Structures are given as structure tokens and as C-alpha cells.
RNA sequence: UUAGCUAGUAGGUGGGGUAACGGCUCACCUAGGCGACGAUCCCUAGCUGGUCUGAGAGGAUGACCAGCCACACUGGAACU
RNA sequence: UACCCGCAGAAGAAGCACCGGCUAACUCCGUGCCAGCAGCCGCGGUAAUACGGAGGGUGCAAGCGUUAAUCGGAAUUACUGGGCGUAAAGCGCACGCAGGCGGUUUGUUAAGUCAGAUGUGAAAUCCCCGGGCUCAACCUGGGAACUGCAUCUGAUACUGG
């Protein structure tokens, strides 16, 4: 059964961008909206939208540069079978700092760069290259 | 594989067994020659190779190779043995140390002498 | 009882001594409660041949520690130099 | 402790001047320098990469006169010290008292300088020292002790060192038989003919 | 300009009605330093002919890699067939910590400081493939910024 | 201010005594999965007031029997 | 290729005992208590700071030095 | 005693293992699947760089080899960091208890998680910066570390209740 809708979102991104999809649609969720917001701020996607009242869909508009995927890779790290948390002094650097890690800190979902500046740890959701 | 399976049963580390069990992790052992005889090797070689059956002080009995040209060993002779198999003699897992206890060194050898137990030519 | 004494921590024919607080029943080099300083019999005249925390020594004496004869001599020496 | 065999055979095997003789005469008049030793030495080999690395390790040892155990200790310390392991290693090898004595010019050869040291003829910073591996340090004075200045050997050695290239990091006053570290040596000054990086490769395996 | 390396020579053979024909293959690499490299695999019935074919193949088939002042931009994982290669940038004076087949490629690329490890098959051909694949994937801050539209101050 | 544990009653059939299960989540030392671990305490239950499945707060005290070295501070929730 | 173990056994009340809390011990009462998060049984073994190896995570180990524990021909007991 | 001075005379002081490939170093003479060699591949049946000797090397050095034993290389028990169509590996199929896992929204808690503070983490050993032995090995001052444990006071995104 569906037990990790975040890995579902990330896989929809990966597959749609490998298929050169213009946009992808998935079931919406607060955490999905937060993660999409972080990705838009870091520029990995063009836009996102939420639509409908009883069963809200979330749409992401994918981004391509010189005919190729802007998202190089997108990888779930914390997962239901094995949760991963890091202290402030242990937050990972993805691609030596060219990529991002998304961290659910106590102050909310943010990049690892932001979390280091705030001095926080948190649950590490995914890596994005 | 699955982490829950590992938590239920950890990775069983293999154990590598010693090739020289009768040596009991000793570097050498003393023993008494109960029989001294010769055997053909296996293919492709041909020879008559010199071997002895030795009861060790710990009561193991082993077959041991007698290296170098000619030897003075006989039944009831007491010798020191070390590890190292001979290949082409299946089951000969040990070497007799030349120049120890009853085992003479090789008489006329002049090179690699310290492997075969023979002393410096003084002149 | 509690005592303040030297512990030999050096090399053959090259002595060096820590100044340590110990239960007198403990071995010379064994268990000790606190380390208080050091003394070197063969330090150069250019070199710090002795150091003590005289304040913590005074604290331990307030608690009833027994100072060793050589440690007492060293304390008199330091308070003569200082 | 020391290599005591035919010294110039070493230069033949390395195919180059190892400075093992004082230079009163060119070595090609004293040996067939271009040809490796022994009866088979005419057949020049195709060295493997391991052979090349080994041959450089050997060359550097065989110039400075250091056996493998001490040379590996130098390597481990140079690998602990900051900066380039190879530059550090060469700085250490150049800091030896016998080497400093040779560079200063009092010994006509490194082995002659090693005698002068070992026989308690050398003083450093005003003190007698007779340990060849003694590490000299900046601003140290080195001098001949006054009972030794009578030896002809040092005079002839000085009359040869005047022909060699002058070191930049040392200073010597030959007429007084004293000198000083003005600087430590640096990779700029030591001969580019030493492939320090092959030494690093060989011990870092 | 070009530096050249010979990585391997291998004697392969074809069986025929009369017996065996032996042929030589040579694997070589060339590069400008400065992050341009190519590899060439040649075949001939003679060793020097194989080497010359390899060099001629390696002068074309040549790629650019965005080196970071003589080290890598970031760690990279390359894979080809059975050969997996991990590479990581290193501080100055580290040198090339690599095996021979990778050391040749990284030397002719001019990557002075690297840590590298081969895993799985060490077969030189596929190792060279995997290393070139990894270096080809590596990307640099300026074009990452161009993709994401940020200024390079984002670094 | 008392250093205190909270757990659930898993047996009440003893006199003046209960068995309390303390349930803790702990990161597995090697594999990093968070595992539930249980520890059972024998606790002084004066008046025999607690019952099965109650959630109860307890504290360390002097030895009271061969097994008992813990005493009930209070019930915090009750079953059914 | 050890699944059931335990009857002072688990708890309670009241005497006794200890420097002291306690089945520590005794009379009576309740009938429990432990165990697949491995009880019971078998084999092996002093423990730790540390040591060796390793990029690290780990793996092996516990000679010298320091801390704790146990023992003193074998098996018991008490005295001061 | 350490240290120093004086005196005679090169005088009193170099071995061990390797040289077919891996792996630096090779040519004669014995001998003929014999005698022997070997860590793995493997050498010898009359032209042996592989056995034994000699002359040449090469490598270590008051040491050199050989045996035993641990970690590495071994990503070859794979947590970091592996596999299961044919190479070893999907139970013959299914149901299902304990166990692991859980769509979405609001409130609450603050167990997991995160932050701060305090105590503790014996000295030695291990790292860094400096002293002393004629250098070194040794000894030693100060620092860092002691990747942890525990108790308070905060945060509530996620997970659990
Ligand atoms: K009682
Ligand atoms: K009892
Ligand atoms: K795994
Ligand atoms: Mg045959
Ligand atoms: Mg020595
Ligand atoms: Mg393999
Ligand atoms: Mg008593
Ligand atoms: Mg025992
Ligand atoms: Mg490893
Ligand atoms: Mg280490
Ligand atoms: Mg002992
Ligand atoms: Mg006895
Ligand atoms: Mg060989
Ligand atoms: Mg012949
Ligand atoms: Mg191994
Ligand atoms: Mg491993
Ligand atoms: Mg496999
Ligand atoms: Mg089959
Ligand atoms: Mg199969
Ligand atoms: Mg099936
Ligand atoms: Mg089913
Ligand atoms: Mg179930
Ligand atoms: Mg269930
Ligand atoms: Mg949920
Ligand atoms: Mg909490």
C-alpha cells in the first residue's frame, strides 16, 4: 500500500522530468506544499499550484535548461523504515554544497544551509542535486 | 538485507580456520618419528619424496616433509617441525626443520645455508 | 590518613616527581586523590624545577592532610624564593 | 651502520655523479661511468614503474648516506610536518650535521665530513657534537674546534669547496673555519634532479 | 601540448582452421592537462602499430572537464559495466591517491589532488570508461547557478 | 521535583504490589532503526488501588522486598 | 541440533537478625513470579582505562602501566 | 658514575636473504621427470636465467631470513557499503496471531527529535605547542580531545501518544 507519499512525490518528479513532462500532478498535503515551496525558492522548479477543495491536487511545473533536466537527482533519505535525524554539527553537505538537503527543523522545513545559519538540527527528508 | 531482518538476526562473521591445527598456534613443535618412508607425488610431477609420520608432544600424529638432499632421520629420532605445506604431496602439511635436535643439516650445501641448518665455512 | 607526597614519575637515573594527594595506604605510584604540582631534582637553573598550587595545598591542610617531609621542604623552598 | 664498499659502483648504477669523490679529477677518468656494473651491466634494462620508484628512493638515500630505517623515520616525520611531504623530507635530509659540514666546505666528501663529525672535531653553537644525524637549526653557528684546525684535510677541503657552487642558506668564513645557518633550505635551491614525489609515492603505497 | 600515457597491452587471439592467430591490443590516454582528456583503444598484429592506432583514436574522442583549480569540484561516482569508481577532491599537496589505471587518466587530465578508489572489476578498459564517465558528469558552480538561476553568491 | 518514571500496569495480582512496564524508544546502536524496548519493574502499590492497563507514575525508593525497589507516586490514567 | 523454569519460589502480616534496607531468617496467609525483548541449561571468559589495525564505521585484543573484582595446598567455620 | 683530558696504532669490529612472473637483480658448469624446488602461477625427462655450485648482481644491515598470530587490502557478512530470470540465492500456494509499516484535517501533549546550561567522563596513552638528555629512542609543562552519560530550561516541523 502507499506508505511514503513523500517518496511518491519525489519519484513523480524524477520520472516526469526523465519523460520530459511539462508538469506533474499529485495528491496535495501540507508537507508536500512545504517541500514544493522550498524547491521553488531554491529554483529547482518553475511553479506550483494547489487546486480543489475536497480532494486538492498539487501541480508542479518542471524546469529545463538547455534542453536538459534542471533536477540532476532527487533522493529520499529519511524513510518510514529508518528515520534519520542529525544534530547541528552533523548536517550533511550535498555535492560539497552545490545541492541541497531539505531538513524539517523545529522551526519548519528549510535547507540545510538555512538550518546551519539558524543553529538547528532536524529530520533530513531528502537530498536534491 | 532489510534492516528489520538484520535487527532480528545480525551479520554472522565468518571464521577463518588455521591451516596447521596440530601446531596449536605454536610456531614449532617437537615430535618422535614413528615411520620414515617415501611417496610418489601427484601429477604433473614425478619423484620419490621423503616424509615421516611423527607423534607430537601434544599427542597429534602428523606427516611431515624432510627437505634438502639426504637426511639422517630414523624411527625413534626426535625432530622439530614447523608449518608450511608441500604441494603435490596431499596431506603433508608440515616441514621438518633441518639442523634441530636429531635432524642434521645438509652436509655440503653452501648457499641459503640458514634455511638448511649448516654453518659458515670459516676458511 | 590523607597525605601529600611525591610520586616518582621519570626514568632510570633520571628522576622526576609529581606532587600528589593520596590516602597513605595507597601505593606510591598507585591511586591518588588529586595532583598538586611537581618537582624536578635535576632541572636547570634556567628551568622551573618546582611548581605547587599553594592555595589548594592550604585547602587540603585545612581538611587535615599530612604533608611529607620532602614536600614540606619544597614548600619552604618555594616560599623562600617567591 | 655505513656503506663501506666501492663507492663509484654506486654512481655507475645510478648513471650519475653522486659526489662520492671529492672532485680533484673528473670521474670518467676513474670509472666507466656510463655503463652499469658487473658483466651484464652493458645490457640496459627497461625498468618497470616499481623499478623507477625504487631507483629514486635509492638515489636519494645513496647521496645522503642514510639507511632505510632512518630514512623511513625521516619520511614519517616529514609526513607529520606541515606542507609538502617531499619538500619537508629534503629539508630534513639537508639539516643533518654531516651534510651541513659538507656544504660549509670543511669536508672534501660527505664521508670525510662524517669522520670530522664522529671524531669530535666539529662544534655547533659553541658545543662539541659528534652525531652525524644531529639536526642543525636556524642561527646555529658551526665551527672547527681549535685543536682540529691543524689538520691539512680541512684546508684541502676548503680549497675544493671554493670551486663548488656556494649554498644560499649557509654562510661560511673559510679563513676562520666557521659558518652559520642564515636560512633553512628550500625546494628552490636543491637540485631539480631529485623526484621527491616518487619517494612520496613509494612510501605512501 | 598533449601528454600521452600507455595504460595496457594485452595479447588476444583468434582461433582458425590452421591454429591460432595472436593479436595485440593497446589502451592509451592523452590530454592537454587543464581538463581535456581522451582515451583510445587500438588493435593490431604488432605492438607499435596497436599503440599508434590507440594514439590516433585518442586525439579525437576527447572531452572537457571543469576542473577546480587542479582538483575536483565535488565527489563523483562513475560506473561502467562492472567497474565502480569513487573520486573525491583533496587538499593541496595530497597528490594523486589512485590506482595505476585511474592515476594515468587523472594525471593527463591535470587533476593534481584527488582521492580515488576502484570497486568491483578493476578491468582497465572499463575502469577508464567509468572514470571518464564520472569526470564528464562533474559540474561546476557557475553552470549550476545558470541552471538554477541564482547568482554564484549562492555558493 | 522528583526524578520519576511513567509506565503501564501489566500485573496487579500481588498484594500491595504491581508490575509496571516502562516502554522506551531507543536508537539501535548499529543499524539506527528506532526500536521499542521494555523494562519491567516491581512497584509498591499501597491500598491495592491500581488495576491492569492503568498508566501510573512511580519513583525509586529504598528496598522494599526481594524484587520491589520502586514505589507508586500516583495513577495518571485508568483503563476502561 | 537447550522452551519451559521456580515452592522461601513471588508477595503480605508479625516475631528474630544486621552498621544498615531487605525471604536475610522463622510462623502463618495469598498463589503467584520469570520467559520468544530468549527464561532454564551447555561451552567459553576476570572487567575497564586502553593496545594493534583501519580513511572511517568497524575488527581483534585486555602482555607492560593505572582503576575495580576474585583467590592464597583442597573443602568448610568462626574468633579478635 | 655521566662528562672531560692524555697516549699507541687502521689498528680491535659485517653478515643474511634474494636474481622465471607478481617483484629490484643473470651468465657459465653439474645434472637429465632423477636428485631437488615452491607464498600463488609453476620448474627438472641431455642447451634449466626456476634444482646444486661458481662469477656477477639486487635488497636489508648487527642484523637477515623462516614459522606462528591479528587488522588491512576483502565492497569477501556490504550500518556507512552487496545480492536472489540463467552465475549461490523467491518458501509449491494461501490464510493469519505476535511483530514491522501507516491516506488526509484540526486541537492537545512534549515520548522520539532539536537547542541552551550544569555535573560527570580518574591519571597515563593518543594529537598540538614548548622544555631536558651531546642528538634520537626515552622524560616532561600546557592545551586539545576524552566521539559518551546524566539532570534541568526552552522549540513543536516531523514521528509517537
Ligand atoms: K519482617
Ligand atoms: K529466600
Ligand atoms: K545494505
Ligand atoms: Mg611429468
Ligand atoms: Mg640500528
Ligand atoms: Mg571482485
Ligand atoms: Mg562486621
Ligand atoms: Mg579462566
Ligand atoms: Mg576498509
Ligand atoms: Mg591510526
Ligand atoms: Mg603477568
Ligand atoms: Mg601449588
Ligand atoms: Mg622467483
Ligand atoms: Mg645446463
Ligand atoms: Mg582479510
Ligand atoms: Mg570489511
Ligand atoms: Mg556479490
Ligand atoms: Mg544450473
Ligand atoms: Mg542458480
Ligand atoms: Mg513462486
Ligand atoms: Mg496474504
Ligand atoms: Mg499480524
Ligand atoms: Mg498487525
Ligand atoms: Mg501519517
Ligand atoms: Mg522530550
Q: Is B3's CB within 8 Å of F35's CB?
A: no
Are D101 and D81 within one domain? no
Q: Is residue D2 part of a domain?
A: no
Coil, strand or helix at D28: helix
CA D96 to C1' H137 (Å) is 18
The nucleotide whose C1' lies nearest the CA of D134 is H135
Q: How far is F42 from chain A (nearest CA, A)?
A: 33
Are D31 and D61 within one domain? yes
Find cell 545480525 and name the residue. B10
CA dihedral A32, A73, E70, E31 (to 10 degrees): -160
Give chain D's radius of gyration (CA, Å).
18
Ligand 11: centre distance to CA C13 (Å): 26
The nucleotide whose C1' lies nearest the CA of F17 is G11
The nucleotide whose C1' lies nearest the CA of C30 is G66
Ligand 11: centre distance to CA D97 (Å): 45
Ligand 11: centre distance to CA D5 (Å): 48
Q: Is E95's CB within 8 Å of D200's CB?
A: yes
C15 CB less than 7 Å from any atom of strand H: no
Are D111 and D172 within one domain? yes
Written out in words, the top-level CATH class of the domain with range A72-129 is alpha beta
Which chains touch F (3+ CB pairs under 8 A)?
A: A, B
> What stretch of H or E contains D198?
helix D196-204
Instruction: Please state, in angstroms and rounded to a whole number, the distance separating the CA atoms of residues C63 and C57.
Output: 10
Sign of CA dihedral A90, A96, A102, A106: positive
Instruction: Please state, in angstroms and rounded to a whole number, the distance separating the CA atoms of residues E74 and E64.
Output: 16
Tell me where in chain A the CATH 3.30.1490.10 domain(s) lie.
Answer: 72-129
Strands C2-8 and C66-67: parallel
Instruction: Please state, in angstroms and rounded to a whole number, the distance separating the CA atoms of residues A67 and D39.
Output: 69
Q: Is F33's CB within 8 Å of A84's CB?
A: no
Strands F4-11 and D170-173: unpaired
Instruction: Please state, in angstroms and rounded to a whole number, the distance separating the CA atoms of residues E141 and E66.
Output: 10
> What stretch of H or E contains F39?
strand F34-44
**How many of the other CB atoms lie within 10 Å of CB of E41?**
20
**How many of the other CB atoms lie within 10 Å of CB of E98?**
21
Q: Is residue D1 part of a domain?
A: no
Are D76 and D116 within one domain? no
Q: What is the resolution of this structure in A?
A: 2.7
Q: How far is E155 from chain A (nearest CA, A)?
A: 7
Which chain F residues have a beta carbon less than 8 Å from that of A84?
Answer: 32
Which chains touch E (3+ CB pairs under 8 A)?
A: A, D
Instruction: Please state, in angstroms and rounded to a whole number, the distance separating the CA atoms of residues D132 and D96.
Output: 7
Q: Is residue D137 part of a domain?
A: yes
Assigned CATH topology for domain A1-71? Ribosomal Protein S8; Chain: A, domain 1 (3.30.1370)
Interface test with E, best of A98, A114, A117 (most E CBs within 10 A): A98
Are D64 and D124 within one domain? no
Interface test with E, best of D199, D201, D203, D205 (most E CBs within 10 A): D201
Closest CA to F80 of F61, F54, F44, F43: F54
Ligand 9: centre distance to CA E119 (Å): 12
Any residues with CB less than 8 A from the CB of A52 and at least 6 apart, and which? none
Which chain A residues have a beta carbon less than 8 Å from that of F32?
Answer: 82, 84
Domain span including residue C4: 1-81
CATH no. for residue D65?
A: 1.10.1050.10
C24 CB less than 7 Å from any atom of strand G: no
Q: Strand pairing partners for E116?
A: E87
Closest CA to D64 of D203, D201, D205, D191: D191
Do D and A have ≥3 inter-chain CB pairs under 8 A? no
Closest ligand (CA of F64): 1
Domain span including residue D114: 94-181
Give chain B's domains with CATH numbers. Answer: 1-123 (2.40.50.140)
Instruction: Please state, in angstroms and rounded to a whole number, the distance separating the CA atoms of residues D120 and D97.
Output: 12
CA C39 to C1' H123 (Å) is 17
Q: Is residue D43 part of a domain?
A: yes
Q: Which nucleotides of H are covered by protein (CB under 7 A)?
A: 4-6, 14-18, 22-27, 33-45, 52-62, 64-71, 74-75, 77-79, 82-84, 99-106, 111-116, 122-123, 127-129, 131-136, 138-141, 151-152, 154-159
Q: Is E73's CB within 8 Å of A43's CB?
A: no
**Residues E45/E53, Cβ–Cβ less than 8 Å:** no
Q: How far is E39 from chain D (nearest CA, A)?
A: 21
Q: Is D204's CB within 8 Å of E100's CB?
A: no
On whether any CB of chain F is under 8 Å from the CB of B1, the answer is: no
Strands A122-128 and A74-76: antiparallel
DSSP calls for B29-87: EEEEEEEEEEE---TT----EEEEEEEETTS-EEEEE--SS-----TT-EEEEEE---T
Closest CA to D137 of D128, D126, D149, D124: D124
CATH no. for residue D113?
A: 3.10.290.10
Any residues with CB less than 8 A from the CB of A125 and at least 6 apart, and which? A6, A35, A76, A77, A78, A101, A102, A103, A104, A109
For residue B105, the Cα-to-chain-centroid distance in whole angstroms is 16
Report the domain count for chain D.
Answer: 2
Separation in Å, CA A102 to CA A34, A84, E12, E125, E131: 10, 12, 52, 39, 30
Report the domain count for chain C.
Answer: 1
Tell me the HSE value of D104 on the side-chain side, using a 13 A CA sphere.
35
Coil, strand or helix at E22: strand
Are D83 and D148 within one domain? no
Please give residues of chain E from 61 to 120 whose alpha-adjacent beta carbon (CB) lies under 7 Å from any atom of strand H. Answer: 84, 86, 119-120
The nucleotide whose C1' lies nearest the CA of F19 is G33
> What stretch of H or E contains D123?
strand D122-124
Q: How far is A44 from chain E (nearest CA, A)?
A: 6
Instruction: Please state, in angstroms and rounded to a whole number, the distance separating the CA atoms of residues D54 and D68.
Output: 12
Question: What totals of helices (H) and strands (E) does chain E contain, helices first?
Answer: 4, 8
Please give residues of chain F from 40 to 69 whose alpha-adjacent beta carbon (CB) lies under 7 Å from any atom of strand G. Answer: 40, 42, 44, 62-68
DSSP calls for A5-30: HHHHHHHHHHHHHHTT-SEEEEE--H
CA E71 to C1' G33 (Å) is 68
Interface test with A, best of E147, E152, E155 (most A CBs within 10 A): E147
Closest ligand (CA of F66): 2
Chain B stretch 2-31, residues whose beta carbon is closer than 8 A to a beta carbon of chain A: 2-4
**How many of the other CB atoms lie within 10 Å of CB of E48?**
10
CA A76 to C1' H104 (Å) is 21
Name the grid cell of D20: 662520492
Instruction: Please state, in angstroms and rounded to a whole number, the distance separating the CA atoms of residues E29 and E8.
Output: 10
Ligand 6: centre distance to CA D6 (Å): 48
Q: Strand pairing partners for C7?
A: C18
CA A80 to C1' G48 (Å) is 39
Q: Is A95's CB within 8 Å of E148's CB?
A: no
Name the grid cell of D136: 642543525
D69 CB less than 7 Å from any atom of strand H: yes
CA A86 to C1' H149 (Å) is 19
Residue E70, Ramachandran bin (φ over 0: left; ψ between -120 and 50: alpha; else beta): left
Closest CA to B92 of B59, B52, B60, B57: B52
At residue D16, what are phi and psi to the nearest 5 degrees?
Answer: -155, 160
Sign of CA dihedral B84, B88, B91, B97: negative
Closest CA to C50 of C9, C78, C29: C78
Q: Is D200's CB within 8 Å of E97's CB?
A: no
The nucleotide whose C1' lies nearest the CA of F36 is G37
Amino acid at each position: 500500500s502507499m506508505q511514503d507519499p513523500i517518496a511518491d512525490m519525489l519519484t513523480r518528479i524524477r520520472n516526469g522530468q526523465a519523460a520530459n513532462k511539462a508538469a506533474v500532478t499529485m495528491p496535495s498535503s501540507k508537507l508536500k506544499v512545504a517541500i514544493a515551496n522550498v524547491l521553488k525558492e531554491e529554483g529547482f522548479i518553475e511553479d506550483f499550484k494547489v487546486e480543489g477543495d475536497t480532494k486538492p491536487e498539487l501541480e508542479l511545473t518542471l524546469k529545463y535548461f538547455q534542453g536538459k533536466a534542471v533536477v540532476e537527482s532527487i533522493q529520499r533519505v529519511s524513510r518510514p523504515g529508518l528515520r534519520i535525524y542529525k544534530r547541528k554539527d552533523e548536517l550533511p553537505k550535498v555535492m560539497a554544497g552545490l545541492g541541497i538537503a531539505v531538513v524539517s527543523t523545529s522551526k519548519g522545513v528549510m535547507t540545510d544551509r538555512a538550518a546551519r545559519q539558524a543553529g538547528l538540527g532536524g529530520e533530513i527528508i531528502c537530498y536534491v542535486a | 538485507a532489510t534492516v528489520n531482518q538484520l535487527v532480528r538476526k545480525p551479520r554472522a562473521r565468518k571464521v577463518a580456520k588455521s591451516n596447521v591445527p596440530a601446531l596449536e598456534a605454536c610456531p614449532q613443535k617437537r615430535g618422535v618419528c614413528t615411520r620414515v618412508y617415501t611417496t610418489t607425488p601427484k601429477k604433473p610431477n614425478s619423484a620419490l619424496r621423503k616424509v615421516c609420520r611423527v607423534r607430537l608432544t601434544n599427542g597429534f600424529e602428523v606427516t611431515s616433509y624432510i627437505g634438502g638432499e639426504g637426511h639422517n632421520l630414523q624411527e625413534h629420532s626426535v625432530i622439530l617441525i614447523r608449518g608450511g605445506r608441500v604441494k603435490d604431496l596431499p596431506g603433508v602439511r608440515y616441514h621438518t626443520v633441518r639442523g634441530a635436535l636429531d635432524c642434521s643439516g645438509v652436509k655440503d650445501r653452501k648457499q641459503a645455508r640458514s634455511k638448511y641448518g649448516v654453518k659458515r665455512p670459516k676458511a | 590518613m590523607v597525605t601529600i607526597r611525591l610520586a616518582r614519575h621519570g626514568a632510570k637515573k633520571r628522576p622526576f616527581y609529581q606532587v600528589v594527594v593520596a590516602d597513605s595506604r595507597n601505593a606510591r605510584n598507585g591511586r591518588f586523590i588529586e595532583r598538586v604540582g611537581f618537582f624536578n631534582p635535576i632541572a636547570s637553573e634556567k628551568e622551573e624545577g618546582t611548581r605547587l598550587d599553594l592555595d589548594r595545598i592550604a585547602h587540603w591542610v585545612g581538611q587535615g592532610a599530612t604533608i611529607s617531609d620532602r614536600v614540606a621542604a619544597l614548600i619552604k623552598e618555594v616560599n623562600k624564593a617567591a | 651502520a655505513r656503506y663501506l664498499g666501492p663507492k663509484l659502483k654506486l654512481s655507475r648504477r645510478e648513471g650519475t655523479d653522486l659526489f662520492l669523490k671529492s672532485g680533484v679529477r673528473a670521474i670518467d677518468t676513474k670509472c666507466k661511468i656510463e655503463q652499469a656494473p658487473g658483466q651484464h651491466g652493458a645490457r640496459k634494462p627497461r625498468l618497470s614503474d616499481y623499478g623507477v620508484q625504487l631507483r629514486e628512493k635509492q638515489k636519494v638515500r645513496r647521496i645522503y648516506g642514510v639507511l632505510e630505517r632512518q630514512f623511513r623515520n625521516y619520511y614519517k616525520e616529514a609526513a607529520r610536518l606541515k606542507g609538502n611531504t617531499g619538500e619537508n623530507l629534503l629539508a630534513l635530509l639537508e639539516g643533518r650535521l654531516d651534510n651541513v659540514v659538507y656544504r660549509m666546505g670543511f669536508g672534501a666528501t660527505r664521508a670525510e665530513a662524517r669522520q670530522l663529525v664522529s671524531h669530535k672535531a666539529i662544534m655547533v653553537n659553541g658545543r662539541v657534537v659528534n652525531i652525524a644525524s644531529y639536526q642543525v637549526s636556524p642561527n646555529d653557528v658551526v665551527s672547527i674546534r681549535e685543536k682540529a684546525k691543524k689538520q691539512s684535510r680541512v684546508k684541502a677541503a676548503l680549497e675544493l669547496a671554493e670551486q663548488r657552487e656556494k649554498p644560499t642558506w649557509l654562510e661560511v668564513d673559510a679563513g676562520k673555519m666557521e659558518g652559520t645557518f642564515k636560512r633553512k633550505p628550500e625546494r628552490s635551491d636543491l637540485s631539480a634532479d631529485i623526484n621527491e614525489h616518487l619517494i612520496v609515492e613509494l612510501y605512501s603505497k | 601540448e598533449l601528454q600521452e600515457k600507455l595504460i595496457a597491452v594485452n595479447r588476444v587471439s583468434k582461433t582458425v582452421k590452421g591454429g591460432r592467430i595472436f593479436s595485440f591490443t593497446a589502451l592509451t590516454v592523452v590530454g592537454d592537462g587543464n581538463g581535456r582528456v581522451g582515451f583510445g583503444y587500438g588493435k593490431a598484429r604488432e605492438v607499435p602499430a596497436a599503440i599508434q592506432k590507440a594514439m590516433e583514436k585518442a586525439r579525437r574522442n576527447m572531452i572537457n572537464v571543469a576542473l577546480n583549480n587542479g582538483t575536483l569540484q565535488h565527489p563523483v561516482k562513475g560506473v561502467h559495466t562492472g567497474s565502480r569508481v569513487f573520486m573525491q577532491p583533496a587538499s593541496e599537496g595530497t597528490g594523486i591517491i589512485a590506482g595505476g589505471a585511474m592515476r594515468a587518466v587523472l594525471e593527463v587530465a591535470g587533476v593534481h589532488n584527488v582521492l580515488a578508489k576502484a570497486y568491483g572489476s578493476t578491468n582497465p578498459i572499463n575502469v577508464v570508461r567509468a572514470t571518464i564517465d564520472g569526470l564528464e558528469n562533474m559540474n561546476s558552480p557557475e553552470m549550476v547557478a545558470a541552471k538554477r538561476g541564482k547568482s554564484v553568491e549562492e555558493i | 521535583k522528583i526524578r520519576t518514571l511513567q509506565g503501564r500496569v501489566v500485573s496487579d495480582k500481588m498484594e500491595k504490589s504491581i508490575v509496571v512496564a516502562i516502554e522506551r524508544f531507543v536508537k539501535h546502536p548499529i543499524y539506527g532503526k528506532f526500536i521499542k524496548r521494555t523494562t519491567k519493574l516491581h512497584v509498591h502499590d499501597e491500598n491495592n488501588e491500581c488495576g491492569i492497563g492503568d498508566v501510573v507514575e512511580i519513583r525509586e525508593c529504598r528496598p522494599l522486598s526481594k524484587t520491589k525497589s520502586w514505589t507508586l507516586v500516583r495513577v495518571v490514567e485508568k483503563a476502561v
